[PDB]
């Protein structure tokens, strides 16, 4: 009972300190920057071959190779330039919710409702793709696998916790706890030393991969957070929730900078991605179309559209040349 | 596709696509059903021809040249709103209710109410199974059907009591284009597969009728 009072006063101290740092909103300082106009983006490629809903997609580090997981139980690696299929990996469980690509192109980790993160080796001497390691230890559905190196991966689950794994040994090196709801997404910072995870408790909190410490927590959303992605400089991140609102939080100021809500938007955000410059905030919505937000003025700088069903995944190449979108209509479209 | 190496890469892609289409053909002869219900309600012992295969449990019994795949979602112990949309394309929903449990009956009704009126399952027909007729028949004599349902007013006979429970479950439908196929089952019933088969065939006709434009 006494500690409960201590908990409350600590929140008041944080709120007062957080409010005292606020001097001017982001939309008030950059009011003199000229708008970026209309970003009209045209479909350049249409990747077909999936026979079920597409739930995840990750870009290769060379901005040419893609990976996509679907309910059909197939894992396809695409040549984004010539639209060819490089690999086709049959999964054990057809219920895959996330699917990641290694930064070196050697491995691919891709898992889902089976509570297991399966890692596949592409550069094998036998010419086929084999399941190198199956990571187990999560009691809930898996989401947002992210490779750190060729032998280190961070995973998120519905156990209200995320885990840091060692692919060689197979043991859970570090476990990050503190969420009070299913964790739906995570993103790795460019300096590969920090990451943020968005959970169902309407809160995203910054975690340290080396120490396993919740350095900071961020609030403001009214519903569960569905996606997250860092600003390109690794000093801010953007979240997407079922509240049909996008928000930009700053790690140094510990306060949200601006909101990306529009009166015509009803359905929540599914995916969040940034451009190479950090000016266009692309977000996928449940009303079958993606919107491009000017991340500095909260102005809709065009709409992608085109898809027939809910857009479930977004992806921007490392060089920023193209944007890949996946939806439940079993089609991947590449925009530019 | 100009270079010699790129010509073989295109040949590899076309060979991959052939197997992708072939696997899709073999994935159209199976019926995907969803198992739901409270614990200890017989949701794992409906058909004695199991041929099963913590998390998701599959069951792939076959009947009359048709493949039935049953997905048991129990044991996840997570928020259903985040992964129940994966089963948006299931043919039907199989719900199991235990008539001898007077305490979990209200718990079962909450489960049925949430699932039936879910936004993803607004058109998926439900095959509702009422289990353990004999156990319920003996239980009602010892304790009347009034502690669980204080609003009951009809005769204390088995026929009226069992039908009264059925009416409550169908009172939660509240939607068109959806039909609830009920059936009373016991422990020593072998024709559960036959009951599922005729309901699934009946559900397919309704969806085909809407697609053809007749209705």
């Amino acid at each position: 009972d006494q500690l409960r009072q201590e908990a409350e006063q600590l929140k008041n101290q944080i709120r007062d300190a957080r409010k005292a740092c606020a001097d001017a909103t982001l939309s008030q300082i950059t009011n003199n920057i000229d708008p970026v106009g209309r970003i009209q983006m045209r479909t350049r490629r249409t990747l077909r071959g999936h026979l079920a809903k597409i739930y995840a997609m990750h870009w290769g580090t060379d901005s040419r190779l893609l990976v996509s997981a679907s309910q059909d139980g197939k894992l396809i690696i695409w040549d984004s330039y010539t639209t060819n299929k490089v690999h086709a990996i049959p999964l054990r469980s057809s219920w895959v919710m996330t699917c990641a690509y290694a930064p070196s192109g050697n491995y691919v980790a891709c898992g889902g409702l089976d509570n297991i993160c399966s890692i596949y080796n592409l550069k094998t001497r036998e010419g086929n793709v084999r399941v190198s390691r199956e990571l187990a230890g999560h009691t809930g559905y898996l989401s947002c696998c992210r490779f750190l190196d060729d032998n280190q991966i961070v995973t998120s689950s519905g156990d209200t916790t995320c885990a840091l794994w060692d692919i060689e040994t197979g043991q859970q090196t570090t476990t990050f706890t503190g969420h009070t709801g299913d964790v739906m997404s995570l993103s790795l910072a460019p300096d590969t030393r920090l990451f943020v995870s968005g959970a169902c408790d309407a809160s995203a909190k910054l975690w340290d991969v080396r120490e396993g410490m919740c350095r900071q927590t961020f609030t403001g959303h009214e519903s569960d957070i569905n996606a997250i992605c860092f600003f390109p400089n690794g000093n801010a991140f953007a979240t997407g929730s079922d509240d049909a609102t996008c928000r930009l939080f700053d790690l140094r100021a510990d306060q949200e900078l601006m909101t990306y809500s529009h009166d015509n938007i009803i359905c929540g955000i599914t995916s969040v991605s940034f451009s190479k410059s950090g000016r266009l905030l692309l977000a996928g919505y449940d009303d079958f179309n993606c919107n491009v937000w000017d991340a500095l003025k909260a102005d809709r700088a065009g709409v992608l559209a085109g898809h027939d069903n809910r857009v479930s995944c977004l992806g921007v190449t490392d060089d920023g040349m193209a944007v890949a979108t996946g939806s439940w209509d079993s089609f991947l479209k590449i925009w530019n | 596709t100009l270079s010699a190496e790129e010509r073989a890469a295109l040949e590899r892609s076309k060979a991959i696509e052939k197997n992708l289409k072939e696997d899709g053909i073999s994935a159209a002869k199976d019926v995907k059903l969803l198992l739901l219900g409270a614990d200890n309600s017989g949701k794992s012992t409906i058909v004695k021809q199991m041929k099963i295969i913590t998390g998701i449990v599959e069951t792939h019994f076959t009947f009359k040249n048709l493949h039935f795949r049953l997905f048991d979602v129990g044991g996840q112990r997570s928020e259903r709103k985040k992964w129940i949309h994966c089963f948006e394309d299931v043919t039907a929903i199989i719900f199991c209710v235990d008539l001898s449990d007077y305490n979990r009956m209200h718990e079962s009704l909450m489960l049925f109410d949430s699932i039936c009126n879910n936004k993803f399952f607004i058109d998926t027909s439900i095959i509702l199974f009422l289990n353990k007729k004999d156990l319920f028949g003996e239980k009602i004599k010892k304790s009347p059907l009034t502690i669980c349902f204080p609003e009951y007013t009809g005769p204390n006979t088995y026929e009226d009591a069992a039908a009264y429970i059925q009416a409550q479950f169908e009172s939660k439908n509240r939607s068109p284009n959806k039909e609830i196929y009920c059936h009373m089952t016991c422990a020593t019933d072998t024709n559960n597969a036959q009951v599922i088969f005729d309901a699934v065939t009946d559900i397919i006709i309704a969806n085909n009728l809407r697609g053809c434009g007749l209705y």
Partner: single-chain antibody
Amino acid sequence: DVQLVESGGGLVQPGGSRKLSCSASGFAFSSFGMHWVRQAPEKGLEWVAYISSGSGTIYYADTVKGRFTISRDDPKNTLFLQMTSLRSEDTAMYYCVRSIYYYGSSPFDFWGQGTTLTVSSSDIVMTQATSSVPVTPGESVSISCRSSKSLLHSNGNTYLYWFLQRPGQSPQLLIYRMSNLASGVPDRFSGSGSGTAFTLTISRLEAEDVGVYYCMQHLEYPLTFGAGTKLEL
């Protein structure tokens, strides 16, 4: 362990027919394209025929076009080469090579052990400057060969392959496009080039690097090898 073994060699009379079998054990044979390469006595390597994965696309060399035939038995993991009429030119050590083609693949990594066949009594021309180069260990060696056309495709890839045939062994792939090191080769090897002139450099040469070096083009069929540069110590 990847292993290709060939059998069916021997002494045959002119005008007869022989069949060579290449049984594979250690890799997914059904996904690889298999070539036949023959090496005449102390003359050099020469491409013969190629069958694609799934027996879709088949090619033959102009020398033995319409005379040889290649067949593929995927369930048995065996590759055949049936020769109808044999002259005195057919005598050579026939090798069996696997090849897989996709974005970023290595289509000439593994060569078979080779079988010896003895018989009793337009195209891209690649030329190697020299035939014998004496050198001592620790000294960098540069090997260069030219070509008729420009192997640099419009896609940005240059199709040049460098092989090393140690004495008494089978050729081993070192560089497969212009500078892409093969799997398991030492990092001291490096390659470069510009369109029609290419160079292979070996820094900090070791005693086991001696042998005959061949440069081959894969821009267009038929595949043509170089004259062959021999390193002496």
